[PDB]
Structures are given as C-alpha cells and as structure tokens.
UniProtKB/Swiss-Prot annotation:
This is Aldo-keto reductase family 1 member B1. Coiled coil: none annotated. It catalyses: an alditol + NADP(+) = an aldose + NADPH + H(+); all-trans-retinol + NADP(+) = all-trans-retinal + NADPH + H(+); 9-cis-retinol + NADP(+) = 9-cis-retinal + NADPH + H(+); 13-cis-retinol + NADP(+) = 13-cis-retinal + NADPH + H(+). GO terms for molecular function: aldose reductase (NADPH) activity; all-trans-retinol dehydrogenase (NADP+) activity; allyl-alcohol dehydrogenase activity; glycerol dehydrogenase (NADP+) activity; prostaglandin H2 endoperoxidase reductase activity; retinal dehydrogenase activity. It comes from Sus scrofa. The lineage of its organism: Eukaryota, Metazoa, Chordata, Craniata, Vertebrata. The keyword Phosphoprotein applies. The record marks K77 as: Lowers pKa of active site Tyr. Catalyzes the NADPH-dependent reduction of a wide variety of carbonyl-containing compounds to their corresponding alcohols. Displays enzymatic activity towards endogenous metabolites such as aromatic and aliphatic aldehydes, ketones, monosacharides, bile acids and xenobiotics substrates. Key enzyme in the polyol pathway, catalyzes reduction of glucose to sorbitol during hyperglycemia. Reduces steroids and their derivatives and prostaglandins. Displays low enzymatic activity toward all-trans-retinal, 9-cis-retinal, and 13-cis-retinal. It is found in: Cytoplasm. InterPro entries: AKR, Aldo/ket_reductase_CS, NADP_OxRdtase_dom, NADP_OxRdtase_dom_sf. The modification N-acetylalanine is found at A1.
Amino acid sequence: ASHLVLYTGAKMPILGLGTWKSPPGKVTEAVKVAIDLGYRHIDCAHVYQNENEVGLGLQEKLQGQVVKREDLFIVSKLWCTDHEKNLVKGACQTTLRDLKLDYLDLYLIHWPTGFKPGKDPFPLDGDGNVVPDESDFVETWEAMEELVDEGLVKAIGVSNFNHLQVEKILNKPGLKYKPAVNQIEVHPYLTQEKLIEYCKSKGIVVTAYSPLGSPDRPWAKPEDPSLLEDPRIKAIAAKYNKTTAQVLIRFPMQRNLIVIPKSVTPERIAENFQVFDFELSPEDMNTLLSYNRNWRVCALMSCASHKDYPFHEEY
Ligand SMILES: NC(=O)c1ccc[n+]([C@@H]2O[C@H](COP(=O)([O-])OP(=O)(O)OC[C@H]3O[C@@H](n4cnc5c(N)ncnc54)[C@H](OP(=O)(O)O)[C@@H]3O)[C@@H](O)[C@H]2O)c1
Ligand SMILES: O=C1NC(=O)[C@@]2(CCOc3ccc(F)cc32)N1
C-alpha cells in the first residue's frame, strides 16, 4: 500500500534509500534529494561510516520543515562488534547522536555474527578469518528489547538471519518483542521465496537489500553476472519503457517486500522513485523469479566458519 505495516502497527514505507557505499560528501545531498522526491524511509548503518552525514541531510529537511519526524522511517543497524549485551545501548546511542535523532524507527541486528569488540569493524586473525566473540544473538536480542522499552527505537528486527536463527529468537524463553523485519538480500538471481514465505508466516516484514545486485560492491571482479546489463531484464524493461533498474525495483514491491535501492546520483534517485506507476504482468514476474541462481553478492565469506554464519543453511 505504498508501505507495508509492521506487527506494531507502524507503517513502513515500501521504497527507501540505501546508503551503503554512499560516500560522506555525497550522502548528505542524496538524502536531501530523496526526501525532496518523496522518499520517507532511509536505510542506514553504523558500519557504513556515513551516519553523521545522513544525519545532516535529515536535520536540514526537518528544521527546514520539509518533513516531520513522524513522517520519516529511519532504519539503522547494530554492527557485529557491538553484539555483547552491554555494548548494545551505547552502539544505538552513537547512531542516534550521529543521525541527530531522538529515536529510530527500526534498529536491526545487522548480521547474526558477533565479532570481537573493538574499533576495527572486522577483527581479522592471522589466517584472515574474522574473530568471533563470546555472544549469542539471543542475548543481543535481549538488549535490543531494552531499546524498545526505553523508547530509543520504535521496532527491532534482524538482517541476514536464516529461518532457524529467527526461530531461536521466536522460541526464546521470556521473549518480549519479535523481529518486526528481516532485511535480506533479494533480487532475480536470489529470489528467496522460501525465506520470504517463512518470515511472512511469522508476520515479519522482509526488506530486500541490493535489488540491483550491487554493481558497485568492492569485490565485483569483472566476470560477475550483472543484473542491470542482463539482456533478459533489459527486454522485459523495454516492454514497459522503463529501465532495468525500475523493473528490478518493482519486482520486490510486487512480492510485498520493502525495497531499499542505493544511489547517490540525483537522477537515478528520482528514477528509482518512479516505479509506483505500473505493475509487471504476472508472466514477467514468473520470468524474473526463474532466474534464481542462488547467487549471493553479500556472502560475508570471511566469517564462513563463524558458529552463527547464516548461509550454510538452505534458507
Ligand atoms: N543488511 C545488510 O547486510 C545489507 C547488505 C547490502 C546492502 N544493504 C542495503 O541495501 C542498499 C542497496 O544495496 P547496495 O547498495 O548493496 O546495492 P544496489 O542498490 O543493488 O546497487 C547500487 C548500485 O546500483 C547503482 N544504481 C542505482 N540506481 C541506479 C539506476 N537507477 N540506474 C543504474 N544504476 C543504478 C548505484 O550507482 P550510484 O549510487 O552511483 O548511482 C550503485 O552502483 C544498501 O545501500 C544498504 O542500505 C544492506
Ligand atoms: O550494506 C551492507 N551492509 C553490510 O553489512 C555489507 C554486506 C557484507 O559486506 C560488507 C562489508 C563492509 C561493509 F561496510 C558493509 C557490508 N553491506
């Protein structure tokens, strides 16, 4: 409904601006452009190293009265080095301070993997593996619930959790709040209909990250399948006189999934909002779904031996 509704009642805007890889000197302008274009949901994260600058763009629009705080859906994410129970409130408070916000609308446990605490976001050992920590995300979750109780965040969720990790939370003795969201990688080459179905049976909204398959991911070694340059999606795009991009964004929306496409380019931010004006005919929907190569762009391979690494499971 141009939004999905979380089990709390909160209306979560269906399209949002993604800010990973959005450089600090560009993201304040991208956020500003986006809110002027009507975007009311911004997806952020401590680890993106730009929440201050996202904060500046929001601030300007808020004091410039272009939007009200109640009309904004700001998401941020607890990073892996901050999973120890006692580190969770501090990590949320830094994020609130950098975003210059009194509360978040959604705070997600970014990855199920907790890493050794410290300033390095990926503590690596001599073998190049990331160093784990003494925590289970069930304890992290208990601290995340405290943020709801104190009013720092309006809802809590998870990101990159496999269905068995969500289950461990749902079956937690003394559970106060469920994940309201599971933000996971979704796009034609990783359609995820089984995890989506599981989250939906549990009443957990799904946000699809990397709808365009992350062309700019640092590790895009040239012989990587490009969804935007994929002749097939370009053809179905042609049928609508829309771009590959607009089609790839319409797809998760049509599957009742929140999309958060990233762009620091003003023109492409406008383009990406110009998707609510058509519907993909069900055949085309089925075409796109069939491309499921189970191809993951964000596999976090460096953490593959972590006890809580999410991707060895089917879904
Ligand atoms: N929770 C997680 O662990 C996680 C993981 C990955 C991503 N995410 C979230 O999902 C967001 C989106 O994913 P992503 O940034 O990884 O990748 P993405 O949105 O799939 O791809 C962004 C790339 O596509 C380009 N692009 C955007 N709009 C375009 C358009 N209309 N036409 C042509 N090219 C276009 C961007 O270029 P320009 O920006 O230069 O225009 C950029 O190179 C992230 O920013 C982040 O907020 C979350
Ligand atoms: O937007 C993103 N959030 C993330 O956790 C991820 C996916 C996995 O890999 C990395 C690596 C570095 C980073 F800053 C971020 C990421 N991308």
